[PDB]
Amino acid sequence: NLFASFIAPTILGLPAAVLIILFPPLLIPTSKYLINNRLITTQQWLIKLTSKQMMTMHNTKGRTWSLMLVSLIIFIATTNLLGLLPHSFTPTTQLSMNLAMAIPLWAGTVIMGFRSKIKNALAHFLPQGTPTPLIPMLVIIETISLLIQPMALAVRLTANITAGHLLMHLIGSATLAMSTINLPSTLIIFTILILLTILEIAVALIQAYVFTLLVSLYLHDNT
Amino acid sequence: QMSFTFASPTQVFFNGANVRQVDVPTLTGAFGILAAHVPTLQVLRPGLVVVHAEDGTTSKYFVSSGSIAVNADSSVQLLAEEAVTLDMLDLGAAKANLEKAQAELVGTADEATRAEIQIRIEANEALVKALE
Amino acid sequence: DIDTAAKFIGAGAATVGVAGSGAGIGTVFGSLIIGYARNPSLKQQLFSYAILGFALSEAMGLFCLMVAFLILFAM
Amino acid sequence: DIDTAAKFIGAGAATVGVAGSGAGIGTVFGSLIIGYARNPSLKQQLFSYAILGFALSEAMGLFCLMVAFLILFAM
Amino acid sequence: DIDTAAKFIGAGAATVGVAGSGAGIGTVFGSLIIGYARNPSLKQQLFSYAILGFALSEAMGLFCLMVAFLILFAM
Amino acid sequence: VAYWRQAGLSYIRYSQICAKAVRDALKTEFKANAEKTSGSNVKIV
Amino acid sequence: KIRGILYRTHSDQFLVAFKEVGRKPPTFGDASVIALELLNSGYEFDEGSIIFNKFRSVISYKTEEKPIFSLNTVASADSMSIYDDIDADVLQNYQEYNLANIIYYSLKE
Amino acid sequence: LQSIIKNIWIPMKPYYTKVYQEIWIGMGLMGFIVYKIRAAD
Amino acid sequence: MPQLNTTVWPTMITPMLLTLFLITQLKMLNTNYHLPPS
């Protein structure tokens, strides 16, 4: 009854969760022209400013992912922002979807660190200026954290959009309860919901930039 | 252990003297300087400079600009572009010119020629607090 | 006997306030290093502040161990 | 029984005091790096405080690992 | 049983001591950034103080994880 | 980075106003003597 | 005088020139001005030397040149790593002042 | 079914073959996890 | 927690892969930045 906005949506027995995951790309029109409209002029600028941010820090092999790590910050920042609409089912609150964006991009990042350049990837586990006599303890950290980075991504994003929606939905129910009670209090609980919606707008973008930065930093440490 | 050197462009107050502490008004905030202080180098802002002789007796000059440079061998070289002892400044013109400076800012809106007013304001604001 | 067994919890949980002092003594003796690496000719007076701070925080770390010994034995 | 059960909850909640001896040892050696990078001419005397601070914050951590091994083994 | 029950709250609350070594490794590797932004020509000597502070703060974390795995499986 | 440095000025221009301010607050017994011992006469081609 | 001599051979290699030096005794107000147009000139000078006549006695003097370092050499010298509380701004204010000094000390000698 | 080659695979050809080759090796790991998680449920 | 109902996971995994890897990228390959002229 409380987690209702996270159950897979179905209308007329049809799994409507597919027309919701495939919609974000519909808000990004493209054109071959040279001078287009305001939408594609602002979007092609954001993609320019974004790609120059995540990708500048990479070498030539890391920059071959400049289509992936840009088409990923565009898909997470548009799925989150389409979740703040009323009653909307944002599929980034799903541990299934988030585990499907996290494991491949991570596994495909350490594999290229183990299928090639492996002898160099063996040197990140042991920092440069490290004395020896307590190495058999540090080996646990750099591996067990590596083995849990793919689950850090998918849960840092799941637990931040879920908890952001749960809070806005509870504080919302508060204003509904104090509506039939002292009303000058309703307006102070509501203005908390407004400052909270401006926060959930920012955390809708920040959680997209951090997800695609930590996938970038994993890549930078394997190319 | 300390080798002070306090000198105006036309006057020398200390030279190689052995004082124990100086209190200078650096741009990054004032700090006191005893022997073996960490090597630094700064640039002053309008404010007092208290010099503690070995006898514990002070001496208070009002520098206006310059550059103190504590060195690795505990030598100090404080050079003030205009360092007048407090017995030469007056309180009336400081408070008055500060008002002539403050009142002239609001009538100004250009970023450059207003920046020169705030520097004159703080130079006079640091004056009233030094005298009394 | 649920009370005598409860004393082992109230006395084992009161003694975690000591983890406050132990963190306010590393701040004091970590500020004595930052304040002595700047003006080392004050080593005398700084150390007489890193003792007034050490003996005022570690007093709060003893008020906890005072109640830990007030529940465990004085009751 | 009820006692030998609570003896594990008290000895567990008491060794949380080490969480203040881990944030102190961190701040001491966090200022040894800041204080020594500012005045590297004092390496031997700054490090002679980061050993005192290491031993004095870790002395409040032993006070918790001791009161843990008192409810757990002594009584 | 009440032993196998309480030995889970004990070993489950003893491991909060790692909260110390979480913020002790964050300060050591936090101040190493400030110690290097100041004197970058000491990068080899600074980083050897960070690894000393990272291994002595985390060692206090292991002493807690060591106890939680002592009141669980050892006895 | 202070405000005047953001405003284009330099420390020489900062020091010229701070030193002018001190002299402008000197008393008349010393203000005449101090202004000519530090006044400017050089000129740019 | 120093301009009217070298104005023939090296005239385009000439950033700026000054006047009124010599009538009145040189004061810091004169050295401070000369330092400004040496900065309000758009010349990204990376090294400098000032040549003056070092006074020794009534009978004889010697010509001398004092070096003038810019920011990127005083901020990059690994002997300046001991100096505390230094960032690349408090060195700029210190290099801009030490340009008016070495000019003033030169105008008195 | 043409232009599914031209518009849909001709562009993605240099990526789906060379650049994302190790992605699919990871995407197989993921599919093994999802089925296993659903197998124990 | 309805995120744990693993019966509707393949309904979230496949239409994501069909978007993050084929439809969103295809629309990026159509966004090109030509080099400036002389």
Curated annotation (Swiss-Prot), chain A:
Which keywords describe this protein according to UniProt? ATP synthesis, Cardiomyopathy, CF(0), Disease variant, Hydrogen ion transport, Ion transport, Leber hereditary optic neuropathy, Leigh syndrome, Membrane, Mitochondrion, Mitochondrion inner membrane, Neuropathy, Primary mitochondrial disease, Retinitis pigmentosa, Transmembrane, Transmembrane helix, Transport
Q: Where in the cell is it found?
A: Mitochondrion inner membrane
Q: Which purpose does this protein serve, as stated in its record? A: Subunit a, of the mitochondrial membrane ATP synthase complex (F(1)F(0) ATP synthase or Complex V) that produces ATP from ADP in the presence of a proton gradient across the membrane which is generated by electron transport complexes of the respiratory chain. ATP synthase complex consist of a soluble F(1) head domain - the catalytic core - and a membrane F(1) domain - the membrane proton channel. These two domains are linked by a central stalk rotating inside the F(1) region and a stationary peripheral stalk.
PROSITE patterns per record: ATPASE_A
User: Can you say what this protein is called?
Assistant: ATP synthase F(0) complex subunit a
Q: Name one GO biological process term.
A: proton motive force-driven ATP synthesis
The chemistry this enzyme catalyses reads: H(+)(in) = H(+)(out)
Ribonucleoprotein listed as a keyword: no
Family affiliation: Belongs to the ATPase A chain family.
**One MF term in the entry's GO annotations:** proton channel activity
Where are the bilayer-spanning segments? 3-23, 65-85, 94-114, 135-155, 161-181, 186-206
- How does the record say this protein sits in the membrane? Multi-pass membrane protein
Q: Which organism is it from?
A: Homo sapiens
Give the highest taxon in the source lineage: Eukaryota
Q: Where the protein is mainly located, per its record?
A: mitochondrion
Under CDD domains, the record lists: ATP-synt_Fo_a_6
* One annotated Gene Ontology cellular component of this protein: mitochondrial inner membrane
Q: Do the record's keywords include Cell membrane?
A: no
Swiss-Prot record, chain B:
Coiled-coil intervals? none
- What Gene Ontology biological process does one annotation of this record name? aerobic respiration
Query: Per its record, what are the GO molecular function terms?
Result: proton-transporting ATP synthase activity, rotational mechanism; structural molecule activity
GO terms under cellular component: mitochondrial inner membrane; mitochondrial matrix; mitochondrion; proton-transporting ATP synthase complex
Q: Which UniProt keywords apply?
A: Acetylation, ATP synthesis, CF(1), Disease variant, Hydrogen ion transport, Ion transport, Membrane, Mitochondrion, Mitochondrion inner membrane, Primary mitochondrial disease, Transit peptide, Transport
Compartment(s) of residence: Mitochondrion; Mitochondrion inner membrane
Main subcellular location: mitochondrion
Q: Which residues carry this modification: N6-succinyllysine?
A: K100, K129
Q: Which residues carry this modification: N6-acetyllysine?
A: K100, K129
Q: Organism's domain of life?
A: Eukaryota
Please give the family membership noted in the entry. Answer: Belongs to the ATPase epsilon chain family.
Q: Relate the assembly described in the record.
A: Component of the ATP synthase complex composed at least of ATP5F1A/subunit alpha, ATP5F1B/subunit beta, ATP5MC1/subunit c (homooctomer), MT-ATP6/subunit a, MT-ATP8/subunit 8, ATP5ME/subunit e, ATP5MF/subunit f, ATP5MG/subunit g, ATP5MK/subunit k, ATP5MJ/subunit j, ATP5F1C/subunit gamma, ATP5F1D/subunit delta, ATP5F1E/subunit epsilon, ATP5PF/subunit F6, ATP5PB/subunit b, ATP5PD/subunit d, ATP5PO/subunit OSCP.
Q: What is this protein called?
A: ATP synthase F(1) complex subunit delta, mitochondrial
> Species name for this entry?
Homo sapiens (Human)
Q: Which residues of the full protein are shown?
A: 37 to 168 of 168
UniProtKB/Swiss-Prot annotation, chain F:
Q: Pfam families, per this entry?
A: ATP-synt_Eps
Look up keyword Metal-binding and say if it applies. Answer: no
Q: Which InterPro entries match?
A: ATP_synth_F1_esu_mt, ATP_synth_F1_esu_sf_mt
List the expressing tissues: Ubiquitous.
Keyword Membrane assigned: yes
Q: Could you tell me where this protein is found in the cell?
A: Mitochondrion; Mitochondrion inner membrane
Signal peptide bounds: none
Per UniProt, which keywords does this protein have?
Acetylation, ATP synthesis, CF(1), Disease variant, Hydrogen ion transport, Hydrolase, Ion transport, Membrane, Mitochondrion, Mitochondrion inner membrane, Primary mitochondrial disease, Transport
Give the GO molecular function terms: hydrolase activity; proton-transporting ATP synthase activity, rotational mechanism
Entry's Gene Ontology BP terms: proton motive force-driven ATP synthesis; proton motive force-driven mitochondrial ATP synthesis
- Top-level taxonomic group: Eukaryota
Its GO CC terms? mitochondrial inner membrane; mitochondrial matrix; mitochondrion; proton-transporting ATP synthase complex
| Positions bearing N6-acetyllysine | K20, K31, K36, K43
Pathological association = Mitochondrial complex V deficiency, nuclear type 3: A mitochondrial disorder with heterogeneous clinical manifestations including dysmorphic features, psychomotor retardation, hypotonia, growth retardation, cardiomyopathy, enlarged liver, hypoplastic kidneys and elevated lactate levels in urine, plasma and cerebrospinal fluid.
Q: Which family does it belong to?
A: Belongs to the eukaryotic ATPase epsilon family.
Name of this protein: ATP synthase F(1) complex subunit epsilon, mitochondrial
Curated annotation (Swiss-Prot), chain I:
Q: Which GO terms describe its cellular component?
A: mitochondrial inner membrane; mitochondrion; proton-transporting ATP synthase complex
Mind telling me which residue stretches traverse the membrane in this protein? Answer: 8-21
Family label: Belongs to the ATPase protein 8 family.
Subunit structure, per the record?
Component of the ATP synthase complex composed at least of ATP5F1A/subunit alpha, ATP5F1B/subunit beta, ATP5MC1/subunit c (homooctomer), MT-ATP6/subunit a, MT-ATP8/subunit 8, ATP5ME/subunit e, ATP5MF/subunit f, ATP5MG/subunit g, ATP5MK/subunit k, ATP5MJ/subunit j, ATP5F1C/subunit gamma, ATP5F1D/subunit delta, ATP5F1E/subunit epsilon, ATP5PF/subunit F6, ATP5PB/subunit b, ATP5PD/subunit d, ATP5PO/subunit OSCP.
Q: How does it sit in the membrane?
A: Single-pass membrane protein
Q: Where in the cell is it found?
A: Mitochondrion membrane
Cited function: Subunit 8, of the mitochondrial membrane ATP synthase complex (F(1)F(0) ATP synthase or Complex V) that produces ATP from ADP in the presence of a proton gradient across the membrane which is generated by electron transport complexes of the respiratory chain. ATP synthase complex consist of a soluble F(1) head domain - the catalytic core - and a membrane F(1) domain - the membrane proton channel. These two domains are linked by a central stalk rotating inside the F(1) region and a stationary peripheral stalk.
GO BP annotations, alphabetical order: proton motive force-driven ATP synthesis; proton motive force-driven mitochondrial ATP synthesis
Q: What is this protein called?
A: ATP synthase F(0) complex subunit 8
Range covered out of full length: 1 to 38 of 68
